Tab-separated table of C-alpha atoms and ligand atoms in Angstrom:
chain	number	residue	atom	x	y	z
A	2	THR	CA	13.698	5.179	18.556
A	3	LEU	CA	14.771	8.556	18.149
A	4	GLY	CA	10.922	10.393	15.860
A	5	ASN	CA	12.366	12.787	13.736
A	6	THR	CA	11.424	10.991	10.661
A	7	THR	CA	8.822	12.649	8.194
A	8	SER	CA	7.969	9.788	5.502
A	9	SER	CA	6.642	11.252	1.837
A	10	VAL	CA	4.546	8.996	-0.133
A	11	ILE	CA	4.180	10.111	-4.027
A	12	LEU	CA	0.889	9.876	-5.010
A	13	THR	CA	-0.225	9.255	-9.230
A	14	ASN	CA	-3.256	11.874	-10.132
A	15	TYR	CA	-5.165	10.367	-12.657
A	16	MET	CA	-8.066	12.354	-14.447
A	17	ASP	CA	-8.202	14.983	-11.110
A	18	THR	CA	-10.542	12.083	-9.707
A	19	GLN	CA	-8.210	9.266	-8.127
A	20	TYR	CA	-5.069	9.739	-5.927
A	21	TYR	CA	-2.864	6.918	-5.236
A	22	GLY	CA	0.843	5.802	-3.543
A	23	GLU	CA	2.054	2.748	-3.224
A	24	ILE	CA	2.379	0.202	-0.088
A	25	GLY	CA	4.428	-3.191	0.591
A	26	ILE	CA	2.779	-6.231	1.662
A	27	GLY	CA	4.596	-9.006	2.749
A	28	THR	CA	8.173	-10.873	2.707
A	29	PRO	CA	9.480	-9.928	0.098
A	30	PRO	CA	7.090	-7.022	-0.439
A	31	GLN	CA	4.250	-7.473	-2.966
A	32	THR	CA	3.293	-4.064	-4.155
A	33	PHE	CA	0.010	-2.492	-4.593
A	34	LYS	CA	-1.598	0.988	-5.236
A	35	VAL	CA	-3.621	2.437	-2.781
A	36	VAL	CA	-6.105	5.128	-2.035
A	37	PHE	CA	-5.040	6.984	1.262
A	38	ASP	CA	-8.867	7.620	2.900
A	39	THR	CA	-9.475	9.480	5.512
A	40	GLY	CA	-13.115	8.687	5.251
A	41	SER	CA	-12.106	5.012	6.315
A	42	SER	CA	-10.290	3.119	9.260
A	43	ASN	CA	-9.845	-0.344	7.339
A	44	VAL	CA	-6.681	-1.303	5.160
A	45	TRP	CA	-7.471	-3.791	2.223
A	46	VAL	CA	-6.222	-5.046	-0.848
A	47	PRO	CA	-7.450	-7.907	-3.494
A	48	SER	CA	-6.817	-11.685	-3.035
A	49	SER	CA	-5.186	-14.083	-4.613
A	50	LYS	CA	-8.002	-16.169	-3.778
A	51	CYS	CA	-10.453	-13.785	-5.936
A	52	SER	CA	-12.502	-15.391	-8.511
A	56	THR	CA	-14.339	-10.281	-11.270
A	57	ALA	CA	-13.461	-6.924	-10.830
A	58	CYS	CA	-10.306	-8.932	-9.187
A	59	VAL	CA	-9.122	-9.727	-12.334
A	60	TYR	CA	-8.094	-6.229	-13.131
A	61	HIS	CA	-6.377	-5.570	-9.979
A	62	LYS	CA	-2.699	-6.936	-8.486
A	63	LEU	CA	-3.822	-9.717	-6.357
A	64	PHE	CA	-2.101	-10.750	-2.763
A	65	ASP	CA	-0.674	-14.206	-2.580
A	66	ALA	CA	-0.153	-15.057	1.311
A	67	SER	CA	1.821	-18.274	-0.166
A	68	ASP	CA	4.698	-16.028	-1.081
A	69	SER	CA	4.751	-14.482	2.481
A	70	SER	CA	7.022	-15.533	4.924
A	71	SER	CA	6.107	-12.760	7.393
A	72	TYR	CA	2.231	-13.877	6.873
A	73	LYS	CA	-0.203	-14.881	9.803
A	74	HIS	CA	-3.159	-16.420	9.087
A	75	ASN	CA	-6.281	-15.244	10.516
A	76	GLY	CA	-9.505	-15.846	8.426
A	77	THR	CA	-11.990	-13.895	10.353
A	78	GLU	CA	-14.601	-12.643	7.520
A	79	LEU	CA	-14.548	-8.790	6.973
A	80	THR	CA	-17.445	-7.233	4.873
A	81	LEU	CA	-17.084	-3.420	4.110
A	82	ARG	CA	-20.098	-1.645	2.826
A	83	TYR	CA	-19.600	1.023	-0.091
A	84	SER	CA	-22.580	2.986	-1.970
A	85	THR	CA	-22.481	0.713	-4.755
A	86	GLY	CA	-22.171	-2.745	-2.505
A	87	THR	CA	-20.157	-4.936	-0.418
A	88	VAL	CA	-16.142	-5.407	-0.478
A	89	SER	CA	-15.773	-8.547	1.145
A	90	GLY	CA	-13.312	-10.995	2.076
A	91	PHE	CA	-11.116	-11.937	5.537
A	92	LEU	CA	-8.478	-11.028	7.761
A	93	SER	CA	-5.222	-11.779	7.370
A	94	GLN	CA	-1.620	-10.372	9.013
A	95	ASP	CA	1.543	-9.007	7.495
A	96	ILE	CA	4.194	-6.702	7.150
A	97	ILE	CA	3.118	-3.291	5.528
A	98	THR	CA	5.530	-0.654	4.440
A	99	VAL	CA	4.573	2.656	3.759
A	100	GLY	CA	7.228	5.871	2.906
A	101	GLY	CA	9.667	3.506	4.593
A	102	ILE	CA	7.931	2.979	7.639
A	103	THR	CA	7.230	-0.922	8.066
A	104	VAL	CA	4.152	-1.972	10.395
A	105	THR	CA	3.154	-5.689	11.385
A	106	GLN	CA	-0.512	-5.038	9.945
A	107	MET	CA	-4.116	-6.805	10.533
A	108	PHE	CA	-5.830	-5.901	6.777
A	109	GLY	CA	-8.506	-7.224	4.581
A	110	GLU	CA	-7.824	-9.898	1.839
A	111	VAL	CA	-10.836	-9.003	-0.378
A	112	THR	CA	-12.252	-12.037	-2.098
A	113	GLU	CA	-15.305	-9.960	-3.196
A	114	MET	CA	-15.487	-6.556	-4.854
A	115	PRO	CA	-18.618	-4.654	-6.786
A	116	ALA	CA	-17.753	-4.273	-10.632
A	117	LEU	CA	-18.652	-0.326	-9.786
A	118	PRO	CA	-16.788	1.559	-8.977
A	119	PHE	CA	-13.773	-0.896	-8.884
A	120	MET	CA	-13.897	-1.697	-12.688
A	121	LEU	CA	-12.768	2.103	-13.104
A	122	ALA	CA	-10.054	1.792	-10.265
A	123	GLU	CA	-6.656	2.307	-11.483
A	124	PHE	CA	-5.543	1.679	-7.697
A	125	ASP	CA	-5.945	-1.959	-6.011
A	126	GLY	CA	-6.798	-1.742	-2.044
A	127	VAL	CA	-7.639	1.243	0.427
A	128	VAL	CA	-5.333	2.461	3.360
A	129	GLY	CA	-8.007	3.735	5.901
A	130	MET	CA	-6.185	7.014	7.498
A	131	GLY	CA	-9.349	7.026	9.635
A	132	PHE	CA	-9.771	6.190	13.692
A	133	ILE	CA	-10.508	2.472	15.067
A	134	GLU	CA	-14.027	3.929	16.371
A	135	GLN	CA	-14.882	3.305	12.727
A	136	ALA	CA	-12.447	0.717	11.873
A	137	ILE	CA	-14.754	-2.791	10.794
A	138	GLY	CA	-13.974	-5.439	13.270
A	139	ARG	CA	-12.381	-2.977	15.102
A	140	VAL	CA	-9.030	-4.052	13.702
A	141	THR	CA	-6.139	-1.309	14.306
A	142	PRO	CA	-5.408	1.299	11.690
A	143	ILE	CA	-2.505	1.641	10.360
A	144	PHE	CA	-1.831	5.029	11.504
A	145	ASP	CA	-2.499	3.773	15.104
A	146	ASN	CA	0.439	1.364	14.399
A	147	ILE	CA	3.229	3.518	13.070
A	148	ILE	CA	1.979	6.616	16.090
A	149	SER	CA	2.979	3.235	18.426
A	150	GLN	CA	6.522	2.747	16.854
A	151	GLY	CA	7.265	6.323	17.955
A	152	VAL	CA	9.360	6.972	14.747
A	153	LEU	CA	7.065	10.073	13.770
A	154	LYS	CA	8.070	14.017	13.966
A	155	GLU	CA	4.933	14.425	15.301
A	156	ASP	CA	1.568	12.481	15.475
A	157	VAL	CA	0.316	13.860	12.095
A	158	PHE	CA	0.109	13.425	8.283
A	159	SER	CA	-0.594	15.771	5.011
A	160	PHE	CA	-2.039	15.844	2.247
A	161	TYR	CA	-0.898	17.440	-1.043
A	162	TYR	CA	-3.266	16.860	-4.361
A	163	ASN	CA	-1.960	18.504	-7.690
A	164	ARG	CA	-4.080	19.746	-10.733
A	165	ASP	CA	-2.777	16.966	-13.746
A	169	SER	CA	3.434	16.718	-18.230
A	170	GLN	CA	5.600	14.780	-15.608
A	171	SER	CA	5.322	16.965	-12.668
A	172	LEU	CA	3.844	15.384	-9.034
A	173	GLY	CA	0.267	13.866	-8.992
A	174	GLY	CA	0.398	14.433	-4.831
A	175	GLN	CA	2.037	13.781	-1.839
A	176	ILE	CA	1.415	12.474	1.589
A	177	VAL	CA	3.762	13.322	4.528
A	178	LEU	CA	3.903	10.927	7.771
A	179	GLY	CA	5.090	12.781	10.810
A	180	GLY	CA	4.280	16.469	9.065
A	181	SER	CA	3.745	18.718	6.496
A	182	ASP	CA	5.731	19.886	3.121
A	183	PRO	CA	6.077	23.425	3.237
A	184	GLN	CA	7.083	23.436	-0.341
A	185	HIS	CA	3.257	22.361	-1.306
A	186	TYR	CA	1.608	25.310	0.811
A	187	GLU	CA	1.629	28.819	1.313
A	188	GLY	CA	1.301	31.010	4.730
A	189	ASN	CA	0.637	29.124	7.807
A	190	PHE	CA	-2.510	26.858	8.791
A	191	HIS	CA	-5.539	27.271	10.068
A	192	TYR	CA	-7.001	24.708	12.616
A	193	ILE	CA	-10.397	23.412	13.017
A	194	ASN	CA	-10.702	20.968	16.043
A	195	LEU	CA	-12.986	18.203	15.199
A	196	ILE	CA	-16.323	17.919	16.218
A	197	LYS	CA	-15.737	14.233	18.196
A	198	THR	CA	-12.281	12.041	18.239
A	199	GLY	CA	-13.264	8.926	15.928
A	200	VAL	CA	-14.346	11.032	12.866
A	201	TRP	CA	-12.602	13.312	10.645
A	202	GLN	CA	-15.550	15.889	10.869
A	203	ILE	CA	-15.765	19.088	11.519
A	204	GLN	CA	-18.459	21.785	12.228
A	205	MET	CA	-19.298	23.575	9.085
A	206	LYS	CA	-21.030	27.536	9.447
A	207	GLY	CA	-21.977	28.327	6.103
A	208	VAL	CA	-21.900	27.442	2.170
A	209	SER	CA	-22.135	30.450	0.248
A	210	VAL	CA	-22.307	31.493	-3.561
A	211	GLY	CA	-21.192	34.537	-4.066
A	212	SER	CA	-21.628	36.934	-1.364
A	213	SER	CA	-24.440	35.405	0.271
A	214	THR	CA	-25.245	32.225	2.668
A	215	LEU	CA	-27.496	30.039	0.784
A	216	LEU	CA	-26.667	26.981	2.731
A	217	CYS	CA	-26.146	25.680	5.924
A	218	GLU	CA	-26.946	28.864	7.559
A	219	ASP	CA	-27.908	27.103	11.140
A	220	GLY	CA	-24.763	24.895	11.120
A	221	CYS	CA	-23.861	21.170	9.301
A	222	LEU	CA	-21.089	19.088	9.545
A	223	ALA	CA	-18.405	18.532	7.165
A	224	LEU	CA	-16.307	15.099	6.549
A	225	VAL	CA	-12.613	15.954	5.160
A	226	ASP	CA	-12.219	13.147	2.680
A	227	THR	CA	-9.027	12.064	1.151
A	228	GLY	CA	-10.809	9.097	-0.379
A	229	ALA	CA	-13.421	11.023	-2.095
A	230	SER	CA	-12.936	12.400	-5.458
A	231	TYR	CA	-15.361	15.422	-5.327
A	232	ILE	CA	-16.982	18.346	-2.966
A	233	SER	CA	-20.460	16.806	-1.655
A	234	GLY	CA	-23.384	17.209	0.111
A	235	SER	CA	-26.383	15.532	0.622
A	236	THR	CA	-29.234	15.186	-2.607
A	237	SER	CA	-31.325	18.295	-1.032
A	238	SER	CA	-28.226	20.689	-0.434
A	239	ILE	CA	-26.692	20.182	-4.049
A	240	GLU	CA	-30.267	20.413	-5.444
A	241	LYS	CA	-30.650	23.656	-3.743
A	242	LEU	CA	-26.695	24.742	-4.873
A	243	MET	CA	-27.123	23.657	-8.357
A	244	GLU	CA	-30.236	25.682	-8.910
A	245	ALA	CA	-27.830	28.593	-7.844
A	246	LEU	CA	-25.192	27.912	-10.064
A	247	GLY	CA	-27.707	27.385	-13.018
A	248	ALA	CA	-26.510	23.734	-13.485
A	249	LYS	CA	-28.724	21.088	-15.190
A	250	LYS	CA	-28.763	17.079	-13.846
A	251	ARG	CA	-27.501	14.659	-16.276
A	252	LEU	CA	-27.413	10.540	-14.760
A	253	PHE	CA	-24.326	10.891	-13.186
A	254	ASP	CA	-23.242	14.615	-12.493
A	255	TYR	CA	-24.348	18.354	-12.877
A	256	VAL	CA	-23.204	20.155	-16.271
A	257	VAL	CA	-22.877	23.666	-17.517
A	258	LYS	CA	-22.807	25.056	-20.558
A	259	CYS	CA	-18.919	25.180	-21.340
A	260	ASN	CA	-18.687	28.879	-22.236
A	261	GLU	CA	-21.274	29.902	-18.971
A	262	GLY	CA	-18.699	27.820	-17.391
A	263	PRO	CA	-15.351	30.755	-16.659
A	264	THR	CA	-18.599	32.842	-15.292
A	265	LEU	CA	-19.659	30.518	-12.425
A	266	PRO	CA	-19.383	32.405	-8.979
A	267	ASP	CA	-17.454	31.555	-6.418
A	268	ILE	CA	-18.435	29.295	-3.569
A	269	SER	CA	-17.168	29.718	0.137
A	270	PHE	CA	-17.591	26.826	3.036
A	271	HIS	CA	-16.922	28.684	6.214
A	272	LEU	CA	-14.796	26.565	8.456
A	273	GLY	CA	-13.365	27.817	11.932
A	274	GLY	CA	-12.468	31.692	11.530
A	275	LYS	CA	-12.282	31.418	8.057
A	276	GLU	CA	-14.322	31.223	4.441
A	277	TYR	CA	-12.737	29.033	1.810
A	278	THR	CA	-13.223	29.754	-1.700
A	279	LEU	CA	-13.294	27.788	-4.520
A	280	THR	CA	-13.581	29.842	-7.711
A	281	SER	CA	-15.203	28.314	-10.873
A	282	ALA	CA	-11.550	27.201	-12.250
A	283	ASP	CA	-11.483	25.074	-9.339
A	284	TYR	CA	-15.216	22.941	-9.507
A	285	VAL	CA	-15.310	23.083	-13.378
A	286	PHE	CA	-14.114	20.483	-15.448
A	287	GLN	CA	-13.067	22.943	-18.518
A	288	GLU	CA	-12.452	20.663	-21.175
A	289	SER	CA	-13.685	23.287	-23.579
A	290	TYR	CA	-15.023	26.670	-24.117
A	291	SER	CA	-17.668	26.007	-26.706
A	292	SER	CA	-21.561	26.790	-26.155
A	293	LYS	CA	-22.287	23.711	-28.175
A	294	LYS	CA	-20.875	21.248	-25.303
A	295	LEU	CA	-21.152	20.613	-21.631
A	296	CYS	CA	-18.952	20.646	-18.785
A	297	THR	CA	-18.826	18.800	-15.500
A	298	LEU	CA	-19.139	20.341	-11.813
A	299	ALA	CA	-16.399	18.777	-9.534
A	300	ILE	CA	-19.508	18.689	-7.272
A	301	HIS	CA	-22.022	15.881	-6.482
A	302	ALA	CA	-24.559	14.544	-4.176
A	303	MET	CA	-23.264	11.702	-1.771
A	304	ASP	CA	-25.715	10.658	1.126
A	305	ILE	CA	-23.684	9.088	3.330
A	306	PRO	CA	-25.743	7.007	6.144
A	307	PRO	CA	-25.545	7.643	10.099
A	308	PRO	CA	-23.633	7.671	12.100
A	309	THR	CA	-21.184	9.832	9.991
A	310	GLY	CA	-23.901	11.210	7.682
A	311	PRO	CA	-25.720	13.265	6.694
A	312	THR	CA	-22.815	15.347	5.971
A	313	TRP	CA	-21.260	17.298	3.510
A	314	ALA	CA	-17.350	15.936	2.431
A	315	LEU	CA	-14.553	17.616	1.221
A	316	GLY	CA	-12.819	15.668	-1.123
A	317	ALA	CA	-10.289	16.126	-3.811
A	318	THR	CA	-11.928	19.338	-5.110
A	319	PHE	CA	-11.532	21.095	-1.704
A	320	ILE	CA	-8.016	19.415	-1.172
A	321	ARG	CA	-6.469	20.639	-4.448
A	322	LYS	CA	-7.168	24.229	-3.437
A	323	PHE	CA	-6.286	23.556	0.238
A	324	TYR	CA	-2.934	21.666	1.774
A	325	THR	CA	-4.547	19.429	4.323
A	326	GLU	CA	-2.904	18.381	7.785
A	327	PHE	CA	-4.540	15.509	9.606
A	328	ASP	CA	-3.467	16.248	13.567
A	329	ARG	CA	-4.049	12.914	16.186
A	330	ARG	CA	-2.385	14.396	18.998
A	331	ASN	CA	-4.241	17.476	19.374
A	332	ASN	CA	-7.489	16.108	17.284
A	333	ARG	CA	-7.647	19.085	14.227
A	334	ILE	CA	-7.555	19.416	10.720
A	335	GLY	CA	-5.245	22.348	9.536
A	336	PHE	CA	-5.534	24.157	6.416
A	337	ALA	CA	-3.411	26.321	3.948
A	338	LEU	CA	-3.233	27.454	0.468
A	339	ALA	CA	-1.703	24.379	-1.766
A	340	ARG	CA	1.429	25.374	-4.046
B	401	0LS	CL1	-17.276	10.051	-5.963
B	401	0LS	C1	-16.394	9.147	-4.783
B	401	0LS	C2	-17.122	8.706	-3.452
B	401	0LS	C3	-16.492	7.983	-2.928
B	401	0LS	C4	-15.588	7.363	-3.308
B	401	0LS	N1	-15.040	6.305	-2.260
B	401	0LS	C5	-15.589	6.060	-0.917
B	401	0LS	C6	-15.494	7.072	-0.076
B	401	0LS	C7	-14.201	7.373	0.631
B	401	0LS	N2	-13.963	7.566	1.755
B	401	0LS	C8	-15.368	6.379	2.561
B	401	0LS	C9	-16.316	6.975	1.418
B	401	0LS	C10	-17.172	7.934	1.902
B	401	0LS	C11	-17.897	7.544	3.385
B	401	0LS	C12	-17.414	8.089	4.633
B	401	0LS	C13	-18.026	8.156	5.863
B	401	0LS	C14	-18.633	6.891	5.759
B	401	0LS	C15	-19.455	6.561	4.690
B	401	0LS	C16	-18.877	6.703	3.581
B	401	0LS	C17	-14.014	5.230	-2.508
B	401	0LS	C18	-12.555	5.325	-1.857
B	401	0LS	C19	-11.768	4.629	-1.983
B	401	0LS	C20	-12.071	3.354	-3.778
B	401	0LS	C21	-13.300	3.221	-3.354
B	401	0LS	C22	-14.186	4.374	-3.302
B	401	0LS	C23	-14.788	7.674	-4.129
B	401	0LS	C24	-14.808	8.950	-4.942
B	402	0LS	CL1	-18.356	4.310	-3.889
B	402	0LS	C1	-18.085	4.775	-5.152
B	402	0LS	C2	-16.968	5.219	-5.608
B	402	0LS	C3	-16.861	6.026	-6.855
B	402	0LS	C4	-17.978	5.671	-7.989
B	402	0LS	N1	-17.833	6.243	-9.044
B	402	0LS	C5	-16.331	6.602	-9.854
B	402	0LS	C6	-15.874	7.803	-9.570
B	402	0LS	C7	-16.608	9.222	-10.495
B	402	0LS	N2	-15.895	9.887	-11.147
B	402	0LS	C8	-14.580	9.608	-10.837
B	402	0LS	C9	-14.647	8.158	-10.146
B	402	0LS	C10	-13.409	8.003	-9.243
B	402	0LS	C11	-13.039	6.571	-8.644
B	402	0LS	C12	-12.801	5.363	-9.440
B	402	0LS	C13	-13.311	3.912	-8.574
B	402	0LS	C14	-12.991	3.958	-7.556
B	402	0LS	C15	-13.082	5.367	-6.480
B	402	0LS	C16	-13.376	6.440	-7.298
B	402	0LS	C17	-18.781	5.962	-10.118
B	402	0LS	C18	-20.087	7.069	-10.471
B	402	0LS	C19	-20.912	6.936	-10.754
B	402	0LS	C20	-20.936	5.740	-11.965
B	402	0LS	C21	-20.132	4.786	-11.815
B	402	0LS	C22	-18.843	4.954	-10.927
B	402	0LS	C23	-18.976	5.391	-7.447
B	402	0LS	C24	-18.995	4.909	-6.286
B	403	NAG	C1	-8.752	-12.882	14.397
B	403	NAG	O1	-8.200	-11.653	14.748
B	403	NAG	C2	-8.859	-11.186	15.899
B	403	NAG	C3	-8.784	-10.036	16.403
B	403	NAG	O2	-9.176	-9.255	17.712
B	403	NAG	C4	-8.781	-12.411	17.209
B	403	NAG	O3	-9.692	-12.220	18.140
B	403	NAG	C5	-9.103	-13.746	16.450
B	403	NAG	O4	-8.818	-14.951	17.803
B	403	NAG	C6	-8.081	-13.975	15.214
B	403	NAG	N1	-8.351	-15.279	14.690
B	403	NAG	C7	-7.595	-16.465	14.705
B	403	NAG	C8	-8.164	-17.549	14.064
B	403	NAG	O5	-6.241	-15.707	14.675
């Protein structure tokens, strides 16, 4: 029918690392907490057929759904900690009011890491079919198909942690209340991945990395800003940060004095100040403070690349444009 629709999905912000909203699967709807991930293209939730990370999440019960259509084809999703395994199923999925018949994964095996830490149940991949495992049609392609959206775009707002809004996803447009000024666009290197060309990473007023150009994946599913092990070893050396097992730290008192970090994308320099990347949990010289920048070695074909996750998105309201194959950034509000 008439496409003037702009569906808003409200997100919960858990500790500035997990941003999740709800979806409803089946007849009647079974609700799930999901992360909306531009870095992946498959929809998956835990199955009732799950034996132990599962135990801790909401399980989908096909036997309680009148709209369910069996499939059973094996689904295997590679994560950096191991495999998320299950089988395909088809059901009616509700997201921000829009209902679509979707092929999704009913997960029967999850690695304990990171899933034991997850406040959310499953994943809703906002990526392209080119990266969908089993060539399964992604949710956004199916929403596009309905011809309901105002524009063939979706936007992300991630807040900084009080009864305030954790985040928001607008399907069919952007929310001007959550951004200031106008959007600056960067075309995708190629369709099939939410990845753009990056022309430099600067510490202060000097380009220290990516001087000859590199790739930047705009990943809403990633908690932090990430680079390859070698890029982050060099960047952390420049910042004077020290490696620990899972992160890099600075003495808490040294944190507010850390230089600005800039990402050269399109015609602009996108700047993050120390307040945007330091988890300032204290101001003590006797305590250590974590950085919201990590090393993540993304495997080919997508990698090696940088990934602009929640750390970048909190600063810059992001619009994913499928009609035009571009990403737009505006300063978040
Ligand atoms: Cl810190 C952190 C690091 C990773 C995540 N992820 C996985 C990343 C989010 N998008 C896909 C993947 C990166 C990738 C992109 C392209 C190709 C390969 C990998 C996650 C997301 C949701 C649930 C569980 C994990 C989250 C936080
Ligand atoms: Cl692929 C992948 C995704 C996340 C991790 N994580 C957990 C993430 C790192 N700190 C925030 C947390 C958010 C999260 C929690 C659950 C799911 C997604 C993000 C991890 C890092 C070091 C030690 C243990 C866990 C690891 C691999
Ligand atoms: C499952 O879905 C795939 C989608 O390509 C289809 O080819 C296959 O025949 C389906 N299997 C069953 C048993 O429905």
